[PDB]
Amino acid sequence: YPLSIFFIVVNEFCERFSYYGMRAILILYFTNFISWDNLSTAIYHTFVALCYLTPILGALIADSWLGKFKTIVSLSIVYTIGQAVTSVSSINDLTDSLPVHVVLSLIGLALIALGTGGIKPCVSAFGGDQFEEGQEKQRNRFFSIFYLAINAGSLLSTIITPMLRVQQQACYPLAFGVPAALMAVALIVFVLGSGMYKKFKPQGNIMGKVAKCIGFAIKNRFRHRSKAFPKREHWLDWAKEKYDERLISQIKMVTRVMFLYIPLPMFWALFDQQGSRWTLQATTMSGKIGALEIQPDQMQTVNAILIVIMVPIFDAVLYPLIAKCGFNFTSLKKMAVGMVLASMAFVVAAIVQVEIDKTLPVFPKGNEVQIKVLNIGNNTMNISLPGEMVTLGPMSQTNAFMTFDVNKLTRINISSPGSPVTAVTDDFKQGQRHTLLVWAPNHYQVVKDGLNQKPEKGENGIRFVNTFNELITITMSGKVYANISSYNASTYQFFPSGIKGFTISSTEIPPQCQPNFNTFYLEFGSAYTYIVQRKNDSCPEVKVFEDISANTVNMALQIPQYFLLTCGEVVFSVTGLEFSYSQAPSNMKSVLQAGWLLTVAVGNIIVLIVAGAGQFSKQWAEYILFAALLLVVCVIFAIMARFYTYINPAEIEAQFD
């Protein structure tokens, strides 16, 4: 056995290495191709689950045509072709009638989808066939090692890709080129073992036979309405009239096994939340370990790291111990327990989420308007606002955003000690944060803020205010603010953490002045407003004011909810695709594997259907998304398993003829 297996393991590692590397690069490109006709966003959202709809086509083929060995090679090549075409097409689009070049990408993208689908069910079952001598212990070992290699690809893909990218947009050819290069090695190694594999060929069009037998049964069962209508077997009694008895047995085994997958696709909807829903949470909870600088979007890597260490533990020690006390852990039992853990993984998130909410600010909603007053003048100013007055000294601000109803924002009067009162004629927009700038009794400016949420990806936003008579231009680490009018403010731009330096430029500034300045440590999620003022020597001067406070909750707090969920997946998923193979009849192994994969496809639909917010806060969504659904489904599953779908020893049943 050992010789035949190693080829499949290394092939799967390389094949899944490539797939993950394609995902990250693929999404970035659409942001550039979207600039013709928003159609690109419509092109996407197919690969979200379409990569799991194809495996139907792979199953139909091998089990009724070409066998499994031939479909692995053929579907593999078309996978390689698609990537190569896609890689060159992107370069052809930018280097060189735009839809004509784009058509190249579409064919490549479509040609890839078949590759990713037809291989998943075929390769998994093809390994199992190598064990025949009552080797349950060895066969169980393989399916955990095989599932371990999948992640060893995911982990190495994450580390390698960022270094690979931006090596040269000029690096795009390598971006798609290198993943394509690897799979070529995957195909070569798999073929090299042809002399060692054990293979079986289909005896005919089983697909047709199964469909015809089922078709005959249902129509015949419809007849005989008042003559022995009550079935003994819902289909077998009536198909047996014409069709072979042993074939009737086989279609029955798959029917029972598949009945249990009806409740499962809820679990795969919950497991998917870790990619999108939690990555957003990390953004608003980003205190950083003193030893390193992990970014919000890097956390998801923790799941791959844990699963490459949990899997050896469970098979090595934990399971032997449970046996020694006599619990007799069966395949149905393990799946039932696995769904409970992932349920407790989510409930922890609600606890974490409510902790974070203690700190976040309040953003305006509906007809609400939030105003911050910032006096940048050299004298104290008195401002009249609806039901309130505020006095601000020179270079002073109101530390909080005052919330008012737009309908209630009737009058504002501005005055200074001994100065005339000036009425504000400007207008505001509901649902937006607004900043009011004043420097003299009859001089003021109203500025829209633009930011009304926590900065994305945890990057700090910066902006400047011009007080010089002439226009000013500032560049900060690759980003430029140009031609800022006097007594006006520029829009925000976002930078990652660290310390960033910037250089100022203006015509009124004498050349001998220092234009160079450096900011303090940025941290995460903050947003600040700089003010540039003139010194007695005409040199620029800098002051800082805060708008949104940095992120406080530490990010290490997400390890628990990743530890439970990852621990939940090991027990559930690994046994899911092993039990599915054990029960299937000898003639239709790939049919059931495609049955398991089909569950994941429908899984993404549930989360996608739920779409966005429909409630007050995530404190709810993170809760009902498991309890009202996952536990209710979990109890239903246990009920169905009480009817012994495990009772079929598919290996020996065939020998009865």
XYZ file of C-alpha atoms in Angstrom, residues 232-636:
405
model
C -43.250 -2.267 2.174
C -40.366 -0.328 0.620
C -41.230 3.058 -0.826
C -39.509 2.226 -4.123
C -38.165 -1.327 -3.976
C -41.540 -3.103 -4.010
C -42.419 -1.576 -7.377
C -39.061 -1.501 -9.166
C -38.507 -5.176 -8.335
C -41.241 -6.116 -10.817
C -38.813 -5.700 -13.727
C -35.323 -4.746 -12.572
C -32.495 -6.779 -11.075
C -32.606 -7.449 -7.340
C -28.965 -6.689 -6.532
C -29.135 -3.326 -8.300
C -32.193 -2.547 -6.181
C -30.049 -3.157 -3.104
C -27.360 -0.727 -4.249
C -29.658 2.218 -4.989
C -31.140 1.673 -1.531
C -27.837 1.990 0.331
C -27.094 5.376 -1.225
C -30.638 6.566 -0.537
C -30.403 5.922 3.211
C -26.903 7.373 3.576
C -27.904 10.525 1.720
C -31.050 11.056 3.796
C -28.854 12.127 6.722
C -27.236 15.013 4.820
C -30.474 17.031 4.696
C -29.792 18.774 8.047
C -26.009 19.121 7.645
C -25.790 22.094 5.236
C -26.641 24.385 8.149
C -23.288 23.608 9.772
C -21.316 24.637 6.690
C -23.086 28.000 6.794
C -21.799 28.655 10.319
C -18.242 27.524 9.588
C -18.087 30.007 6.703
C -18.659 33.029 8.957
C -15.037 32.968 10.117
C -13.805 34.327 6.789
C -16.040 37.382 6.466
C -18.039 38.046 9.626
C -15.168 37.673 12.099
C -12.559 39.396 9.928
C -14.721 42.493 10.341
C -14.710 42.028 14.116
C -10.913 41.927 14.249
C -10.852 45.379 12.649
C -12.691 46.970 15.585
C -10.734 44.912 18.160
C -7.083 45.396 17.320
C -4.930 46.094 20.358
C -1.586 44.590 19.357
C 0.753 42.222 21.163
C 3.896 44.013 22.285
C 6.121 41.445 20.577
C 4.701 41.652 17.039
C 2.341 43.552 14.735
C -0.270 41.064 13.471
C -2.773 42.741 11.110
C -6.564 42.319 11.275
C -6.846 40.170 8.150
C -4.078 37.734 9.160
C -5.974 36.098 12.034
C -7.789 33.551 9.864
C -4.413 31.840 9.452
C -4.778 30.647 13.049
C -7.323 28.042 11.954
C -4.851 26.351 9.608
C -2.124 26.426 12.262
C -4.308 24.742 14.882
C -5.711 22.098 12.549
C -2.204 20.899 11.625
C -1.522 20.261 15.311
C -4.947 19.161 16.591
C -5.285 16.354 14.038
C -2.238 14.361 15.247
C -3.386 14.798 18.854
C -6.898 13.425 18.377
C -5.805 10.318 16.493
C -2.690 9.778 18.611
C -3.927 9.904 22.211
C -7.433 11.268 22.771
C -9.355 8.596 20.869
C -7.419 5.683 22.449
C -8.240 7.070 25.901
C -11.971 7.399 25.213
C -12.026 3.758 24.132
C -10.278 2.636 27.318
C -13.148 3.930 29.466
C -15.636 2.151 27.195
C -17.504 5.012 25.522
C -17.381 3.300 22.092
C -17.250 6.440 19.950
C -19.004 5.721 16.646
C -18.973 7.740 13.436
C -22.486 9.078 14.015
C -21.587 10.006 17.597
C -18.526 12.006 16.551
C -20.448 14.060 13.993
C -23.165 14.868 16.530
C -20.609 16.057 19.091
C -18.748 18.114 16.502
C -21.766 20.287 15.745
C -22.126 21.166 19.436
C -18.597 22.558 19.749
C -18.942 24.865 16.749
C -22.150 26.034 18.417
C -20.207 26.904 21.575
C -17.544 28.537 19.407
C -20.065 31.146 18.268
C -21.629 31.926 21.647
C -18.176 32.987 22.832
C -18.110 35.614 20.082
C -21.206 37.306 21.493
C -19.393 37.601 24.826
C -16.375 39.141 23.099
C -18.579 41.357 20.931
C -20.428 42.904 23.867
C -17.076 43.665 25.510
C -15.919 45.615 22.449
C -19.119 47.672 22.314
C -18.230 49.307 25.643
C -15.688 51.472 23.810
C -16.873 52.186 20.266
C -18.277 55.649 19.487
C -21.782 56.529 18.331
C -22.367 57.291 14.656
C -25.396 59.263 13.429
C -28.469 57.512 12.062
C -31.465 58.607 10.041
C -32.405 62.253 10.528
C -29.630 62.666 13.113
C -26.642 64.951 12.571
C -23.423 65.032 14.597
C -21.439 68.275 14.788
C -17.957 68.884 16.181
C -16.816 72.476 16.723
C -13.124 73.329 16.376
C -11.941 76.899 16.954
C -8.625 77.475 15.168
C -8.466 81.229 15.807
C -6.175 83.114 18.163
C -9.072 84.324 20.346
C -11.830 82.697 22.363
C -15.162 82.314 20.566
C -18.748 81.866 21.764
C -21.099 79.753 19.642
C -24.877 79.427 19.974
C -26.389 76.061 19.050
C -29.898 74.569 19.379
C -30.596 74.537 23.106
C -26.921 75.017 23.978
C -23.968 77.394 23.773
C -20.274 76.509 23.601
C -17.250 78.700 24.331
C -13.911 77.535 22.910
C -10.525 79.111 23.475
C -7.836 79.484 20.827
C -6.760 76.176 19.284
C -9.459 74.292 21.188
C -12.166 71.780 20.312
C -15.262 70.134 21.715
C -14.150 66.699 22.901
C -17.421 65.013 21.870
C -19.672 64.988 18.824
C -22.916 66.770 19.655
C -25.924 64.952 18.194
C -28.916 66.943 16.951
C -32.001 66.283 14.872
C -31.825 67.994 11.485
C -35.364 69.293 12.003
C -34.148 70.816 15.289
C -31.071 72.468 13.711
C -32.816 75.787 13.153
C -30.394 78.558 14.161
C -26.687 78.892 14.892
C -25.120 82.169 16.020
C -21.367 82.782 16.194
C -19.787 85.533 18.279
C -16.623 86.405 20.183
C -16.120 88.463 23.359
C -16.871 92.014 22.249
C -17.437 90.941 18.639
C -20.653 91.055 16.586
C -22.846 87.970 16.293
C -22.803 86.152 12.943
C -25.594 83.821 11.841
C -24.630 80.618 10.046
C -26.228 80.401 6.604
C -24.664 77.067 5.626
C -26.571 73.785 5.390
C -25.876 70.264 6.634
C -26.660 66.724 5.498
C -28.488 64.237 7.703
C -26.637 61.073 8.637
C -23.181 62.624 8.247
C -20.536 63.773 10.702
C -19.829 67.486 10.353
C -16.969 69.687 11.523
C -17.324 73.440 12.042
C -14.173 75.566 11.812
C -14.026 79.130 13.136
C -11.090 81.522 13.429
C -12.700 84.982 13.724
C -16.079 86.436 14.744
C -17.280 86.699 11.126
C -15.120 83.936 9.582
C -16.043 80.249 9.694
C -16.107 77.124 7.546
C -18.379 74.074 7.438
C -16.696 70.815 6.421
C -18.153 67.368 5.847
C -16.159 64.656 7.605
C -16.655 61.770 5.175
C -15.891 59.135 7.804
C -18.919 57.645 9.566
C -17.556 54.226 10.549
C -14.476 52.570 11.970
C -11.696 52.784 9.343
C -11.485 49.693 7.164
C -8.696 47.158 7.697
C -7.719 49.039 10.847
C -5.813 51.753 8.985
C -5.561 55.199 10.559
C -7.011 58.150 8.663
C -5.225 61.499 8.484
C -6.099 64.949 7.167
C -4.752 68.492 7.311
C -6.072 72.043 7.634
C -4.543 75.016 5.826
C -4.194 78.325 7.672
C -1.557 79.916 5.432
C -2.700 82.627 3.045
C -1.388 80.697 0.035
C -2.099 77.162 -1.128
C -0.102 74.325 0.423
C 0.839 70.845 -0.773
C 1.864 67.923 1.436
C 3.067 64.404 0.625
C 3.146 61.614 3.217
C 4.662 58.222 2.376
C 3.441 57.926 -1.207
C 0.199 59.907 -0.839
C -0.207 63.559 -1.765
C -2.466 66.370 -0.584
C -2.239 69.155 -3.161
C -3.575 72.704 -3.434
C -5.352 72.901 -0.083
C -7.139 76.245 -0.025
C -6.544 78.603 2.879
C -8.786 77.886 5.872
C -10.079 74.665 4.336
C -9.557 70.999 5.147
C -8.534 68.048 3.010
C -10.234 64.665 2.978
C -9.006 61.648 4.909
C -6.530 59.089 3.619
C -5.673 55.831 5.334
C -2.275 54.470 6.383
C -1.222 51.351 8.320
C 0.358 51.448 11.774
C 3.830 52.746 12.578
C 5.403 56.192 12.357
C 4.998 58.124 9.106
C 6.937 61.164 7.927
C 5.672 63.866 5.593
C 7.008 66.946 3.807
C 5.148 70.236 3.343
C 5.427 72.548 0.341
C 4.018 75.981 -0.435
C 4.852 79.164 -2.312
C 4.533 81.453 0.722
C 6.996 79.290 2.688
C 10.570 80.627 2.365
C 12.949 77.946 1.050
C 15.108 77.992 4.195
C 12.228 76.722 6.353
C 12.044 73.082 7.401
C 9.265 71.296 5.456
C 9.923 67.933 7.116
C 7.888 66.570 10.025
C 7.113 63.195 11.587
C 3.997 61.846 13.264
C 3.705 59.871 16.477
C 2.872 56.169 16.612
C -0.352 55.509 14.708
C -1.667 52.358 16.466
C -4.982 51.081 14.996
C -8.375 52.382 13.945
C -7.657 55.962 14.977
C -8.431 59.129 13.030
C -6.672 62.441 13.593
C -6.757 66.006 12.284
C -3.548 67.988 11.825
C -3.475 71.788 11.766
C -0.711 73.648 9.925
C 0.042 77.155 11.186
C 2.611 79.867 10.524
C 5.460 80.646 12.897
C 6.873 84.127 13.418
C 9.678 83.062 11.064
C 7.054 81.984 8.473
C 8.106 78.374 9.072
C 5.338 75.749 9.205
C 4.104 74.474 12.549
C 2.031 71.409 13.385
C -0.693 70.669 15.926
C -2.788 67.528 16.369
C -6.383 66.902 17.431
C -8.164 63.578 17.855
C -11.467 62.507 16.295
C -11.689 58.732 16.846
C -9.762 57.042 19.643
C -7.439 54.144 18.920
C -8.533 50.524 19.168
C -8.251 49.114 22.691
C -9.403 45.490 23.024
C -6.496 43.120 22.453
C -6.634 40.752 19.490
C -5.395 37.703 21.402
C -8.978 37.341 22.661
C -9.997 35.713 19.368
C -7.922 32.570 20.006
C -10.651 30.879 22.115
C -13.428 31.100 19.526
C -10.936 29.883 16.922
C -9.776 27.031 19.155
C -13.260 25.635 19.773
C -14.398 25.998 16.167
C -11.206 24.455 14.795
C -11.489 21.659 17.353
C -15.091 21.235 16.229
C -14.172 20.909 12.557
C -11.589 18.162 13.115
C -14.043 15.751 14.718
C -16.882 16.567 12.307
C -15.381 17.083 8.851
C -12.699 14.379 8.976
C -15.228 11.707 9.927
C -17.746 13.196 7.512
C -15.817 12.265 4.381
C -14.601 8.954 5.810
C -17.982 7.620 6.918
C -19.438 8.651 3.559
C -16.934 6.412 1.741
C -17.311 3.447 4.093
C -21.050 3.020 3.481
C -21.198 3.489 -0.252
C -21.646 0.513 -2.596
C -18.583 -0.628 -4.499
C -19.985 0.702 -7.783
C -20.814 4.274 -6.724
C -18.106 5.572 -4.374
C -17.716 8.892 -6.188
C -21.481 9.441 -6.199
C -21.596 9.754 -2.418
C -18.418 11.826 -2.151
C -20.082 14.286 -4.505
C -23.011 13.908 -2.128
C -20.910 15.172 0.773
C -19.391 18.038 -1.220
C -22.842 19.058 -2.438
C -23.658 19.843 1.194
C -21.040 22.602 1.296
C -22.449 24.115 -1.896
C -25.909 24.589 -0.390
C -24.248 25.692 2.838
C -22.929 28.939 1.371
C -26.427 29.723 0.091
C -27.923 29.971 3.583
C -25.432 32.599 4.734
C -25.635 34.376 1.378
C -29.439 34.366 1.526
C -29.370 35.911 5.006
C -27.444 38.758 3.319
C -26.723 41.752 5.587
C -28.071 43.289 8.759
C -31.674 42.763 9.794
C -31.476 43.594 13.492
C -30.144 46.063 16.037
C -26.636 44.742 16.654
C -24.214 41.884 16.078
C -24.734 40.932 19.725
C -27.864 39.239 18.368
C -26.670 37.989 14.985
C -23.700 36.141 16.469
C -26.172 34.460 18.853
C -29.257 33.433 16.874
C -26.980 32.367 14.028
C -26.079 29.260 16.042
C -28.689 28.655 18.746
C -31.943 29.070 16.840
C -30.370 27.269 13.873
C -27.336 25.127 14.630
C -28.523 23.516 17.867
C -32.050 22.996 16.532
C -30.483 21.295 13.519
C -28.120 19.376 15.807
C -30.954 17.809 17.801
C -32.799 16.929 14.589
